[PDB]
């Protein structure tokens, strides 16, 4: 159970954070979306069923912090709905992470997500991303459900875990 010990170092606070700060800088040089051949903290990915068998992949993405990117209105309005400061994107950043991530590889599908690091200017997450067209996963009894259409593009309708979380179940 390495996965038990991976976060034993990094459970809430460790000097591991100093190392990641170095990784934090270099990632800002990296593209806002990229592919990593091996997922970082398997304790989450395997906890979301990721299998190192051929047909899965890992993706990193970053986003900017702050309140909602909402424009000020201009027409005739009552004061109730016309303020600006204090707004926030109602659906969580954990949710938004997969969205742009989903668009990147439409021939695939999203399952789960998590962040790994965060500074005051960006949030960095990691998302499982699955090919369903692969003639490997096509014959899995353990995931035969995916052969159906309905499992597609789910993250956009909020049927992922984040979506369920955003819906507060």
């Amino acid at each position: 159970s390495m996965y038990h010990y991976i976060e034993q170092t990094w459970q809430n606070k460790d000097w591991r954070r100093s190392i990641l700060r170095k990784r934090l800088i270099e990632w800002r040089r990296q593209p806002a979306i990229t592919r990593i051949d091996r997922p970082t903290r398997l304790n989450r990915a395997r906890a979301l069923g990721y299998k190192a068998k051929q047909g899965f992949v890992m993706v990193r993405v970053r986003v900017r912090r702050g309140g909602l990117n909402k424009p000020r209105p201009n027409s005739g309005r009552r004061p109730k709905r016309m303020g600006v400061y204090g707004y926030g994107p109602s659906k969580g950043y954990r949710w938004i992470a997969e969205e742009r991530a989903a668009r990147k590889f439409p021939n695939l599908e999203v399952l789960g997500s998590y962040y790994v690091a965060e500074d005051g200017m960006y949030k960095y997450y990691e998302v499982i991303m699955v090919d369903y067209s692969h003639p490997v996963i096509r014959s899995d009894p353990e995931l035969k459900w995916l052969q159906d259409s309905v499992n597609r593009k789910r993250v956009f309708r909020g049927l992922t875990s984040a979506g369920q979380k955003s819906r507060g179940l």
Binding site: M2, Y5, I6, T9, W10, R16, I19
Partner: protein, 123 residues
């Protein structure tokens, strides 16, 4: 890297590779980290191997610290791909353990002496 504390010379590493490959038939050797850590947690480890080319560094970063209080020696090898070949595995290996040194027991003990005397100089 940061998960490694003391440097290990190649010649010391080279002997380990010869040491482990001998254990392919006589000794009992653990392959894959899960088969190691619990055995290390089981305090049944005589000697363990930690790769110098792990990615990310945290994948095996716990192993040295746990072996401290468990008082079980550990060794480093730069080329983890070789170790996978060394353990007769078609792919890379990052963590292997020595339940019994099999035939290279004396070779193992010298290595233990080799590392421990360096540890004394490693403070």
């Amino acid at each position: 890297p940061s998960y490694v504390k003391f440097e290990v010379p190649q010649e010391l590493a080279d002997k380990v590779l010869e040491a482990v490959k001998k254990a392919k038939d006589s000794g009992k050797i653990k392959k894959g980290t899960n088969e190691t850590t619990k055995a290390v947690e089981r305090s049944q480890a005589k000697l363990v191997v930690i790769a110098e080319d792990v990615q990310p560094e945290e994948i095996v970063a716990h192993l040295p610290l746990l072996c401290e209080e468990k008082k079980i020696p550990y060794v480093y090898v730069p080329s983890k791909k070789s170790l996978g070949e060394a353990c007769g595995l078609q792919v890379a290996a990052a963590s292997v353990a020595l339940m019994d040194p099999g035939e290279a027991k004396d070779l193992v003990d010298e290595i233990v002496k080799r590392v421990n005397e360096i540890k004394g100089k490693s403070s």
